[PDB]
Short mmCIF file of C-alpha atoms in Angstrom, two decimals:
data_model
loop_
_atom_site.label_atom_id
_atom_site.label_comp_id
_atom_site.label_asym_id
_atom_site.label_seq_id
_atom_site.Cartn_x
_atom_site.Cartn_y
_atom_site.Cartn_z
CA UNK A 1 192.71 35.28 100.47
CA UNK A 2 191.51 32.47 98.16
CA UNK A 3 189.75 32.71 94.82
CA UNK A 4 185.77 31.81 95.95
CA UNK A 5 184.03 34.20 93.44
CA UNK A 6 184.29 35.10 89.62
CA UNK A 7 182.84 38.02 88.42
CA UNK A 8 182.89 39.64 84.38
CA UNK A 9 183.05 43.37 83.40
CA UNK A 10 183.79 44.84 80.35
CA UNK A 11 183.44 47.97 78.17
CA UNK A 12 181.37 48.75 74.82
CA UNK A 13 183.68 49.68 72.11
CA UNK A 14 184.69 53.29 71.72
CA UNK A 15 182.77 55.64 69.44
CA UNK A 16 183.54 58.42 66.54
CA UNK A 17 184.60 61.26 68.84
CA UNK A 18 186.50 59.08 70.65
CA UNK A 19 188.70 59.16 67.37
CA UNK A 20 188.42 62.89 67.32
CA UNK A 21 189.41 62.63 70.88
CA UNK A 22 186.35 63.84 72.33
CA UNK A 23 184.49 62.99 75.29
CA UNK A 24 181.17 61.15 74.79
CA UNK A 25 180.58 61.11 78.89
CA UNK A 26 177.14 61.38 79.67
CA UNK A 27 175.54 61.90 75.77
CA UNK A 28 173.99 59.41 75.33
CA UNK A 29 175.77 58.29 71.72
CA UNK A 30 174.97 54.85 70.37
CA UNK A 31 177.18 52.12 69.33
CA UNK A 32 178.94 52.39 65.83
CA UNK A 33 179.43 49.23 63.85
CA UNK A 34 182.55 48.51 65.49
CA UNK A 35 181.16 49.13 68.96
CA UNK A 36 178.09 46.33 68.02
CA UNK A 37 180.77 43.73 66.35
CA UNK A 38 182.51 43.89 69.31
CA UNK A 39 179.61 43.32 71.67
CA UNK A 40 178.83 40.74 69.54
CA UNK A 41 182.48 39.15 69.96
CA UNK A 42 182.31 39.16 73.69
CA UNK A 43 179.33 37.18 73.81
CA UNK A 44 180.63 34.57 71.23
CA UNK A 45 184.08 34.84 73.57
CA UNK A 46 181.86 34.26 76.65
CA UNK A 47 179.77 31.28 74.95
CA UNK A 48 183.45 29.53 73.80
CA UNK A 49 184.02 29.40 77.67
CA UNK A 50 180.60 28.38 78.98
CA UNK A 51 179.75 31.44 81.12
CA UNK A 52 176.27 31.30 82.73
CA UNK A 53 175.20 34.50 84.41
CA UNK A 54 172.36 34.88 86.84
CA UNK A 55 172.47 39.17 86.45
CA UNK A 56 173.34 41.95 84.63
CA UNK A 57 174.52 45.37 85.97
CA UNK A 58 174.46 48.18 82.94
CA UNK A 59 174.83 52.27 82.92
CA UNK A 60 171.70 54.00 82.01
CA UNK A 61 174.14 54.82 78.81
CA UNK A 62 172.13 53.35 75.86
CA UNK A 63 175.53 51.89 74.52
CA UNK A 64 176.39 49.94 77.58
CA UNK A 65 172.92 48.56 77.52
CA UNK A 66 172.81 47.72 74.00
CA UNK A 67 176.21 46.04 74.61
CA UNK A 68 174.44 43.69 77.42
CA UNK A 69 171.41 42.88 75.07
CA UNK A 70 173.83 42.03 72.42
CA UNK A 71 175.66 39.92 74.63
CA UNK A 72 172.91 37.83 75.96
CA UNK A 73 171.60 37.21 72.63
CA UNK A 74 174.89 35.58 71.49
CA UNK A 75 174.93 33.40 75.25
CA UNK A 76 170.95 32.62 74.59
CA UNK A 77 170.74 34.04 78.10
CA UNK A 78 168.16 37.06 77.17
CA UNK A 79 165.65 35.99 80.44
CA UNK A 80 168.65 36.74 82.50
CA UNK A 81 167.60 39.89 84.80
CA UNK A 82 169.08 43.29 83.94
CA UNK A 83 169.36 46.71 86.69
CA UNK A 84 170.58 49.98 84.88
CA UNK A 85 172.02 52.85 87.36
CA UNK A 86 173.58 56.08 86.68
CA UNK A 87 176.01 54.81 89.19
CA UNK A 88 177.66 52.91 86.21
CA UNK A 89 177.79 55.54 83.92
CA UNK A 90 181.03 57.38 82.07
CA UNK A 91 182.85 60.28 84.18
CA UNK A 92 181.23 63.39 83.84
CA UNK A 93 183.40 65.65 81.76
CA UNK A 94 181.32 68.63 82.76
CA UNK A 95 181.98 71.61 80.48
CA UNK A 96 185.10 69.37 78.41
CA UNK A 97 182.15 67.19 77.04
CA UNK A 98 182.49 67.08 73.27
CA UNK A 99 186.18 69.36 73.32
CA UNK A 100 189.16 68.14 71.29
CA UNK A 101 192.09 68.46 72.94
CA UNK A 102 193.27 72.02 71.36
CA UNK A 103 189.91 73.55 72.43
CA UNK A 104 190.30 72.27 75.99
CA UNK A 105 193.54 74.02 76.21
CA UNK A 106 192.22 77.46 74.84
CA UNK A 107 188.96 77.77 76.79
CA UNK A 108 190.40 76.56 80.49
CA UNK A 109 194.28 76.95 80.15
CA UNK A 110 197.02 74.41 78.92
CA UNK A 111 197.90 73.00 83.07
CA UNK A 112 194.14 72.53 84.05
CA UNK A 113 193.92 70.02 80.96
CA UNK A 114 196.18 67.21 82.15
CA UNK A 115 194.97 67.12 85.50
CA UNK A 116 191.20 66.90 84.17
CA UNK A 117 191.96 64.50 81.80
CA UNK A 118 195.10 62.31 83.54
CA UNK A 119 194.51 63.26 87.36
CA UNK A 120 192.58 60.67 90.14
CA UNK A 121 191.02 63.56 92.20
CA UNK A 122 190.69 66.47 90.18
CA UNK A 123 187.28 67.66 88.94
CA UNK A 124 186.88 69.36 85.65
CA UNK A 125 184.39 72.28 85.77
CA UNK A 126 180.46 72.07 85.74
CA UNK A 127 178.88 71.86 82.47
CA UNK A 128 176.56 74.69 82.41
CA UNK A 129 173.02 75.53 80.80
CA UNK A 130 175.26 77.52 78.05
CA UNK A 131 176.79 74.28 77.14
CA UNK A 132 175.53 72.46 73.67
CA UNK A 133 174.92 69.25 75.23
CA UNK A 134 173.62 70.38 78.72
CA UNK A 135 169.61 70.30 77.65
CA UNK A 136 170.40 66.94 76.05
CA UNK A 137 171.61 65.40 79.48
CA UNK A 138 169.54 67.03 82.67
CA UNK A 139 166.19 66.97 80.75
CA UNK A 140 166.34 63.47 80.14
CA UNK A 141 163.67 61.80 82.17
CA UNK A 142 165.87 58.81 82.67
CA UNK A 143 167.72 61.21 85.25
CA UNK A 144 164.69 62.11 87.37
CA UNK A 145 164.05 58.24 88.42
CA UNK A 146 167.71 57.96 89.81
CA UNK A 147 168.16 56.95 93.72
CA UNK A 148 169.14 60.68 94.26
CA UNK A 149 166.91 63.64 92.99
CA UNK A 150 168.09 65.45 89.33
CA UNK A 151 169.54 68.35 91.03
CA UNK A 152 171.72 66.44 93.46
CA UNK A 153 173.33 64.53 89.89
CA UNK A 154 176.90 65.32 89.66
CA UNK A 155 177.72 68.27 86.84
CA UNK A 156 181.20 66.65 86.83
CA UNK A 157 183.49 64.42 88.13
CA UNK A 158 186.95 63.08 89.28
CA UNK A 159 187.69 59.69 88.55
CA UNK A 160 187.85 59.67 92.98
CA UNK A 161 184.38 61.27 92.14
CA UNK A 162 183.21 58.14 89.93
CA UNK A 163 184.46 55.91 92.39
CA UNK A 164 182.66 57.54 95.50
CA UNK A 165 179.17 57.49 93.69
CA UNK A 166 179.90 53.83 92.40
CA UNK A 167 180.90 52.04 95.22
CA UNK A 168 177.88 52.30 96.69
CA UNK A 169 175.72 50.89 93.79
CA UNK A 170 178.88 48.16 94.38
CA UNK A 171 178.51 47.56 98.22
CA UNK A 172 174.66 48.02 98.32
CA UNK A 173 173.54 46.21 95.39
CA UNK A 174 176.06 44.14 93.20
CA UNK A 175 178.41 42.99 96.18
CA UNK A 176 174.90 41.03 97.78
CA UNK A 177 174.38 39.03 94.68
CA UNK A 178 177.89 38.01 94.54
CA UNK A 179 178.50 36.69 97.88
CA UNK A 180 174.74 34.78 97.01
CA UNK A 181 176.90 32.94 94.64
CA UNK A 182 175.45 34.32 91.32
CA UNK A 183 177.82 34.68 88.34
CA UNK A 184 177.54 38.72 87.71
CA UNK A 185 178.31 40.62 84.25
CA UNK A 186 179.30 44.01 84.49
CA UNK A 187 178.23 46.29 81.22
CA UNK A 188 180.34 49.51 82.11
CA UNK A 189 182.66 52.53 80.34
CA UNK A 190 186.23 53.65 80.68
CA UNK A 191 186.11 55.69 83.72
CA UNK A 192 183.51 53.40 85.63
CA UNK A 193 185.45 50.20 84.88
CA UNK A 194 188.83 51.80 85.88
CA UNK A 195 186.84 52.97 89.30
CA UNK A 196 185.64 49.64 89.89
CA UNK A 197 189.09 47.96 89.58
CA UNK A 198 190.89 50.58 91.60
CA UNK A 199 188.70 49.39 94.88
CA UNK A 200 188.55 45.52 94.08
CA UNK A 201 192.52 45.60 93.65
CA UNK A 202 193.45 48.41 96.27
CA UNK A 203 195.16 50.01 93.15
CA UNK A 204 196.84 53.36 94.16
CA UNK A 205 195.82 56.82 93.51
CA UNK A 206 199.01 57.37 91.09
CA UNK A 207 198.96 53.46 89.40
CA UNK A 208 195.17 53.61 88.51
CA UNK A 209 195.78 56.32 85.82
CA UNK A 210 198.52 54.25 83.94
CA UNK A 211 195.96 50.69 84.23
CA UNK A 212 195.23 49.05 80.64
CA UNK A 213 191.32 48.52 79.93
CA UNK A 214 190.54 47.29 76.08
CA UNK A 215 186.93 47.76 75.07
CA UNK A 216 185.20 44.74 73.87
CA UNK A 217 187.42 42.46 75.83
CA UNK A 218 185.81 40.12 78.91
CA UNK A 219 187.77 40.98 82.40
CA UNK A 220 187.69 38.21 84.78
CA UNK A 221 188.03 39.17 88.31
CA UNK A 222 188.70 36.38 90.76
CA UNK A 223 187.60 37.76 94.43
CA UNK A 224 187.83 36.17 98.01
CA UNK A 225 185.81 35.83 100.84
CA UNK A 226 186.17 39.59 101.46
CA UNK A 227 185.18 40.65 97.51
CA UNK A 228 188.92 41.71 96.91
CA UNK A 229 190.92 40.12 93.96
CA UNK A 230 193.13 37.36 93.96
CA UNK A 231 195.52 38.57 91.70
CA UNK A 232 195.29 40.50 88.73
CA UNK A 233 192.38 41.30 86.77
CA UNK A 234 192.76 38.97 83.61
CA UNK A 235 191.56 39.60 79.57
CA UNK A 236 189.91 36.47 78.56
CA UNK A 237 190.00 35.37 74.55
CA UNK A 238 192.89 35.42 72.07
CA UNK A 239 195.96 37.16 73.06
CA UNK A 240 196.93 38.76 69.66
CA UNK A 241 193.05 40.39 70.17
CA UNK A 242 193.74 41.56 73.30
CA UNK A 243 197.04 43.03 72.41
CA UNK A 244 195.10 44.79 69.48
CA UNK A 245 192.67 46.19 71.34
CA UNK A 246 195.33 47.38 74.22
CA UNK A 247 196.92 49.66 71.32
CA UNK A 248 193.62 50.94 70.71
CA UNK A 249 193.28 52.50 74.10
CA UNK A 250 196.63 53.36 74.44
CA UNK A 251 197.81 57.32 75.58
CA UNK B 1 136.15 56.62 85.43
CA UNK B 2 139.60 56.29 83.21
CA UNK B 3 142.36 57.25 85.33
CA UNK B 4 145.25 55.22 84.08
CA UNK B 5 146.56 53.50 80.64
CA UNK B 6 148.21 50.14 80.04
CA UNK B 7 149.81 49.34 76.79
CA UNK B 8 149.80 45.25 75.67
CA UNK B 9 150.89 43.53 72.75
CA UNK B 10 151.65 40.04 71.46
CA UNK B 11 154.93 39.49 69.46
CA UNK B 12 154.88 38.56 65.84
CA UNK B 13 154.13 34.41 65.05
CA UNK B 14 156.69 32.36 63.44
CA UNK B 15 156.84 29.73 61.20
CA UNK B 16 154.89 26.64 63.13
CA UNK B 17 152.27 29.42 63.56
CA UNK B 18 151.88 28.82 59.69
CA UNK B 19 152.24 25.54 59.95
CA UNK B 20 149.27 25.23 62.79
CA UNK B 21 151.68 24.13 65.29
CA UNK B 22 152.06 25.72 68.73
CA UNK B 23 155.34 27.12 69.78
CA UNK B 24 154.14 27.37 73.64
CA UNK B 25 156.82 26.67 75.97
CA UNK B 26 159.69 26.17 72.93
CA UNK B 27 161.83 29.13 73.09
CA UNK B 28 162.04 29.88 69.01
CA UNK B 29 163.50 33.19 67.96
CA UNK B 30 161.26 35.81 66.41
CA UNK B 31 161.61 35.56 62.39
CA UNK B 32 162.63 37.99 60.20
CA UNK B 33 159.02 39.41 60.23
CA UNK B 34 158.77 39.18 63.72
CA UNK B 35 161.57 41.25 64.25
CA UNK B 36 159.92 43.82 61.60
CA UNK B 37 156.38 44.05 63.83
CA UNK B 38 158.14 45.13 66.88
CA UNK B 39 160.26 47.85 64.97
CA UNK B 40 157.26 49.05 63.28
CA UNK B 41 155.16 48.79 66.86
CA UNK B 42 158.13 51.22 68.44
CA UNK B 43 157.89 53.63 65.71
CA UNK B 44 153.77 53.26 66.38
CA UNK B 45 154.33 53.89 69.83
CA UNK B 46 157.53 56.93 69.32
CA UNK B 47 154.43 58.31 66.67
CA UNK B 48 151.98 58.73 69.31
CA UNK B 49 154.78 60.02 71.85
CA UNK B 50 154.53 57.22 74.93
CA UNK B 51 157.12 57.52 77.83
CA UNK B 52 157.12 53.88 79.47
CA UNK B 53 158.43 53.57 83.17
CA UNK B 54 158.29 49.69 82.92
CA UNK B 55 158.13 46.70 80.83
CA UNK B 56 157.20 43.23 81.97
CA UNK B 57 157.72 40.13 79.32
CA UNK B 58 158.01 36.59 79.64
CA UNK B 59 160.90 34.81 79.85
CA UNK B 60 161.02 33.19 76.22
CA UNK B 61 163.15 35.47 74.01
CA UNK B 62 160.76 36.23 71.45
CA UNK B 63 158.73 38.26 74.09
CA UNK B 64 162.33 39.98 75.76
CA UNK B 65 163.46 40.81 71.91
CA UNK B 66 159.95 42.17 70.84
CA UNK B 67 160.39 44.55 74.41
CA UNK B 68 164.10 45.33 73.37
CA UNK B 69 163.45 46.61 69.73
CA UNK B 70 160.55 48.94 71.15
CA UNK B 71 162.75 50.13 73.27
CA UNK B 72 165.29 50.66 70.98
CA UNK B 73 162.73 52.60 68.58
CA UNK B 74 161.96 54.81 71.68
CA UNK B 75 164.89 55.55 72.62
CA UNK B 76 163.88 54.06 76.01
CA UNK B 77 166.51 51.52 76.08
CA UNK B 78 166.86 52.77 80.08
CA UNK B 79 163.47 51.36 81.08
CA UNK B 80 163.39 48.72 83.61
CA UNK B 81 162.39 45.42 82.13
CA UNK B 82 160.92 42.40 84.42
CA UNK B 83 160.53 38.92 82.95
CA UNK B 84 157.93 36.19 84.48
CA UNK B 85 157.16 32.83 83.69
CA UNK B 86 153.55 33.98 84.39
CA UNK B 87 153.68 35.77 81.11
CA UNK B 88 154.72 32.95 79.43
CA UNK B 89 152.31 31.44 76.15
CA UNK B 90 150.18 28.62 77.39
CA UNK B 91 152.08 25.39 77.84
CA UNK B 92 150.27 23.22 75.29
CA UNK B 93 151.97 20.33 76.99
CA UNK B 94 152.18 16.75 74.59
CA UNK B 95 150.36 18.65 71.47
CA UNK B 96 153.87 20.80 71.67
CA UNK B 97 155.31 20.86 67.99
CA UNK B 98 152.09 18.75 66.01
CA UNK B 99 150.34 20.35 63.57
CA UNK B 100 146.46 19.71 63.41
CA UNK B 101 146.76 16.44 61.39
CA UNK B 102 149.12 14.86 64.28
CA UNK B 103 147.03 15.89 66.85
CA UNK B 104 143.63 14.05 65.67
CA UNK B 105 145.57 10.91 65.00
CA UNK B 106 147.26 10.99 68.24
CA UNK B 107 144.30 12.13 70.69
CA UNK B 108 140.93 11.91 69.07
CA UNK B 109 139.46 14.74 66.65
CA UNK B 110 137.01 15.91 69.57
CA UNK B 111 139.71 16.07 72.42
CA UNK B 112 141.59 18.25 70.09
CA UNK B 113 138.66 21.43 69.03
CA UNK B 114 138.28 21.04 73.44
CA UNK B 115 142.44 21.62 73.73
CA UNK B 116 142.78 24.25 70.91
CA UNK B 117 139.12 26.26 71.42
CA UNK B 118 137.87 25.52 75.05
CA UNK B 119 138.55 28.11 77.95
CA UNK B 120 138.60 25.27 80.51
CA UNK B 121 139.79 21.59 78.83
CA UNK B 122 143.54 21.07 80.02
CA UNK B 123 145.12 19.23 77.08
CA UNK B 124 147.60 16.15 78.30
CA UNK B 125 150.68 17.14 80.19
CA UNK B 126 154.02 16.85 78.24
CA UNK B 127 155.67 13.43 79.12
CA UNK B 128 159.73 13.01 79.35
CA UNK B 129 159.56 11.06 76.19
CA UNK B 130 158.25 14.22 73.72
CA UNK B 131 160.92 15.41 71.83
CA UNK B 132 160.57 19.46 73.18
CA UNK B 133 160.45 18.30 76.97
CA UNK B 134 164.60 18.49 77.80
CA UNK B 135 165.02 21.76 76.13
CA UNK B 136 161.75 23.08 78.36
CA UNK B 137 162.91 21.65 81.52
CA UNK B 138 166.38 21.37 81.86
CA UNK B 139 166.49 25.02 80.74
CA UNK B 140 168.37 26.54 84.15
CA UNK B 141 166.01 30.03 83.24
CA UNK B 142 163.27 27.43 84.78
CA UNK B 143 165.04 26.77 88.15
CA UNK B 144 164.99 30.45 89.25
CA UNK B 145 161.14 30.67 89.19
CA UNK B 146 158.79 31.83 91.96
CA UNK B 147 158.19 27.99 92.36
CA UNK B 148 160.10 25.34 92.04
CA UNK B 149 161.00 23.53 88.61
CA UNK B 150 158.87 20.19 89.83
CA UNK B 151 155.56 22.74 90.30
CA UNK B 152 155.86 24.43 87.16
CA UNK B 153 153.03 23.44 84.17
CA UNK B 154 153.18 20.03 81.96
CA UNK B 155 150.17 21.55 80.15
CA UNK B 156 147.45 24.85 80.53
CA UNK B 157 143.88 25.52 79.77
CA UNK B 158 143.50 29.13 78.92
CA UNK B 159 141.88 29.05 82.64
CA UNK B 160 144.93 27.41 83.80
CA UNK B 161 147.24 30.59 82.13
CA UNK B 162 144.84 33.44 83.95
CA UNK B 163 144.98 31.85 87.28
CA UNK B 164 149.06 31.54 87.00
CA UNK B 165 149.16 35.12 85.56
CA UNK B 166 146.54 36.59 88.06
CA UNK B 167 149.20 36.23 90.89
CA UNK B 168 151.93 38.45 88.65
CA UNK B 169 149.21 40.80 87.88
CA UNK B 170 147.78 41.54 91.60
CA UNK B 171 151.36 41.39 93.37
CA UNK B 172 153.96 42.92 90.92
CA UNK B 173 151.99 44.43 87.65
CA UNK B 174 148.96 46.24 89.09
CA UNK B 175 150.75 48.16 92.03
CA UNK B 176 153.09 49.97 89.92
CA UNK B 177 149.61 50.98 87.41
CA UNK B 178 148.18 52.58 90.99
CA UNK B 179 151.55 54.43 91.17
CA UNK B 180 150.53 56.05 88.11
CA UNK B 181 154.10 54.60 86.11
CA UNK B 182 153.19 53.72 82.16
CA UNK B 183 153.63 50.00 81.82
CA UNK B 184 154.40 48.09 78.45
CA UNK B 185 153.52 43.96 78.95
CA UNK B 186 155.17 42.20 76.05
CA UNK B 187 153.04 39.04 76.09
CA UNK B 188 152.17 35.87 73.70
CA UNK B 189 148.04 34.67 71.92
CA UNK B 190 147.46 32.95 75.44
CA UNK B 191 148.78 35.58 78.48
CA UNK B 192 147.82 38.94 76.41
CA UNK B 193 144.02 36.98 76.07
CA UNK B 194 144.07 35.86 80.09
CA UNK B 195 144.88 39.51 80.90
CA UNK B 196 142.05 41.19 78.74
CA UNK B 197 139.78 38.56 79.98
CA UNK B 198 140.41 39.50 83.65
CA UNK B 199 141.01 43.00 83.22
CA UNK B 200 137.42 43.54 81.08
CA UNK B 201 135.41 40.97 82.92
CA UNK B 202 134.81 39.20 79.68
CA UNK B 203 132.84 35.33 79.55
CA UNK B 204 134.41 31.99 79.36
CA UNK B 205 132.39 31.92 76.21
CA UNK B 206 132.98 35.46 74.75
CA UNK B 207 137.23 35.13 74.92
CA UNK B 208 137.71 32.63 72.42
CA UNK B 209 136.30 34.45 69.91
CA UNK B 210 138.45 38.23 70.31
CA UNK B 211 140.79 39.35 67.78
CA UNK B 212 144.25 39.72 69.21
CA UNK B 213 146.42 41.39 66.00
CA UNK B 214 150.24 40.69 66.94
CA UNK B 215 152.55 43.94 66.18
CA UNK B 216 149.61 46.43 67.91
CA UNK B 217 149.81 48.67 70.95
CA UNK B 218 146.30 47.31 72.95
CA UNK B 219 145.19 50.46 75.13
CA UNK B 220 143.64 49.46 78.12
CA UNK B 221 142.05 52.58 80.06
CA UNK B 222 141.17 51.55 83.91
CA UNK B 223 139.42 52.85 86.95
CA UNK B 224 140.54 53.12 90.71
CA UNK B 225 139.61 49.56 91.15
CA UNK B 226 141.67 48.54 88.00
CA UNK B 227 138.88 47.59 86.06
CA UNK B 228 138.70 48.44 82.67
CA UNK B 229 136.76 51.42 81.12
CA UNK B 230 135.06 50.57 78.05
CA UNK B 231 136.92 47.99 75.97
CA UNK B 232 140.76 47.84 74.34
CA UNK B 233 141.64 50.13 72.08
CA UNK B 234 144.47 49.15 69.05
CA UNK B 235 146.23 52.10 68.42
CA UNK B 236 147.81 53.34 65.03
CA UNK B 237 146.69 53.42 61.36
CA UNK B 238 143.53 51.33 60.87
CA UNK B 239 144.82 49.61 57.42
CA UNK B 240 147.25 48.20 59.63
CA UNK B 241 145.54 46.86 62.19
CA UNK B 242 142.93 45.68 60.03
CA UNK B 243 145.72 43.56 58.25
CA UNK B 244 147.04 42.39 61.39
CA UNK B 245 143.62 41.11 62.49
CA UNK B 246 142.57 39.51 58.86
CA UNK B 247 146.35 37.65 59.11
CA UNK B 248 144.98 35.92 62.80
CA UNK B 249 141.55 35.73 61.43
CA UNK B 250 142.51 33.61 58.13
CA UNK B 251 145.39 31.41 60.23
#
């Protein structure tokens, strides 16, 4: 249980939809100017702390990939290998994708909606072919060359479901590289970062809902010989800026 | 008969190229013109509806940024990128950073012609006294190559470039072409020229004279033996192509 490995994880800056209380989810929206600035800020902060990455993991959503590219550019580490997987994707919010709070409550019921947003293990209704964002997701050829067939990919996910499709990628692909002594960057999303932290820190089903995950802030994990967190995750950089980022993700 | 299509290109050249200096393994960034060329290449590839499955680059950031800008213009940022020193620009050894005048003074007018224009004459190796030696050989990207740091070349003929590129073609790229994947190679002047020589069976004499414009998609049609069916083709607007040819001609 002694600190042996260091891992950096971060989440991209959130977009217009997030201000309108809409879930982007698997919709492949680009960074906005604020998102691009947050990625550059992360890169400059990681450079100030002399981080030297050996491997980067991202989702297949371009906002996670652009975040990594901008960080590697700020570090002068563009040669560092990048691997992308649907298993680091944001939570699939199913039928709720693109709806604000009001619209969700009207369509599905006020009770069901609380669970879907705030619970650990309640799965939202699956996205159906009638959904305006269904074709844009499932006709995208990035989902024809995943480690599971197109028709085996989820149509909706609880936070528990996110952890269950992320853990195999951690165990099989990322964890071995950490054990080799490589310094890893994970460019992830709100739910994918929360799911991995739940696993590495042994956070309860009850407590995971409440933890604060600011965007555009490097999250340092110190891991022991079992790849278990030694202490809680640590936010790197200026405490003023971090407190600001924490306020922005407040619910 | 034609069975496979491969796309290659070279990045837009820099200030040193206008001064007749060889950037070589010096890790110079694209200039504004270079970044625009990469974007215009991506827009051209989008107009022709190219869908890449895999991208190969060098470990020099100008080849990587060229690929990133192209994938952004294509909305194909999820397409896997692999980088190798074996796609690096020619190592011009002691000549790196010298203009034509300085080379002739230091080594002799005769030797200099051969080194620039011959197929198989290797320039003098770069030594520890060279102003650009440390920034190449102390760079940790060259500590994790498929050969040890001390086995990497200190200078290369165009023949030497082909001979360290061939193993990457044979072992890494060719198998993916045989799988039916659409490959983009983001390369340099000498690495693109070397691969074309090999796939088209161009002579030692003829290879020196072929025109390789920057920022232009180069299409190769390959048979079941991965031998070129007809010559390479420049894709896009003939006006723009003729302009790009004149820029490398006149330089």
